[PDB]
Amino acid sequence: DWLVDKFKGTSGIDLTKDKMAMQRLREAAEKAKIELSSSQSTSINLPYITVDADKNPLFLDEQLTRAEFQRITQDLLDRTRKPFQSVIADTGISVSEIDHVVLVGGSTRMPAVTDLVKELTGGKEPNKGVNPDEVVAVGAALQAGVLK
Amino acid sequence: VRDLKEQLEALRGESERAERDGDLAKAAELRYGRIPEVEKKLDAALPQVMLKEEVGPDDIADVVSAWTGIPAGRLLEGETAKLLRMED
Known part of the structure; x- marks a missing residue:
């Protein structure tokens, strides 16, 4: 959305109307997020995307900072706070009583999420060592051996 | 001209492919770069009389002139000088 908004801002073109524009914008976005999981800045480069009135x-040459990324995405990061708390509340168990935190889903690789977790859990540190997207599969494999 | 037409069309086939492959770099590069580039070149050569390729409204007149000996043509740029120097 940001990419489209800035593209449009510069060219006046609605990239959402071109499906191919939108597919590579999603690829670029995906990788942009990925890069910002460690970098403070990432570059989006999609040349000759679509066609304007003057040909x-x-x-598309855009610089997305991790700070800008958060300015944008915190609208969604904040949505997580309430359900995190609702589990805490439903069990009556404070964060200080949590022995271990497990983050799964690749999006948890982001520092925006990590730091949020740190606030959420009082600094109680999530266990790293297994890729967050793979974690569940790993456990399953383990149960498959334990089970049989 | 013909060559330019062929080239144009090839590029058009490539822009289709860029959209099939989702290649933006080439997608519009073709769609508003290469294709209109050759299109314009084509168009510039395109105006390019003598033996066009179809029986106009004057080939019939020329046949009728061979017939009956009566000349009914268009004053083909050489007789229009004799018909001006006729008096002299």
């Missing part, structure tokens, strides 16, 4: 070269 001018439309090169």
Whole structure:
């Protein structure tokens, strides 16, 4: 959305109307997030995306900072706080009583999420060592051996 | 001209493919770069009389002129000088 908004801001073109524009915008976005999981900045480069009124070269060249990324995505990061708390509340168990935190889902690789977890859990540190997307599969495999 | 038409069309086939492959870099590069580039070149050569390729409204007149000996043509740029120097 940000990429489209900035592209449009510069060219006046609705990239959402071109499905191919939108597919590579999603690829770029995915990788942009990935890069910002460690980097403070990432570069989006999609040249000659679509066609404007004057057939001018439309090169999407955008710099997304991790700070900007958070300014944008915190609208969604904040949505997590309430259900985290609702589990805490439903069990009557404070964060200080949690022995271990497990983060799963690749999006938890982001520092925005990590730091949020640190606030959420009072600094109680999530266990790293297994890829968050793979974690569950790993456990399952383990149960498959334990079970049989 | 013909060559330019062929080239144009090839590029059009490539822009289809860029959309099939989701390649933006080439997608519009073709769609508003290469294709209109050759299109314009084509168009510039395109105006390019003598033996066009179809029986116009004057080939019939020329046949009728061979017939009956009566000349009914268009004053083909050489007789229109004799018909001006006729008096002299």
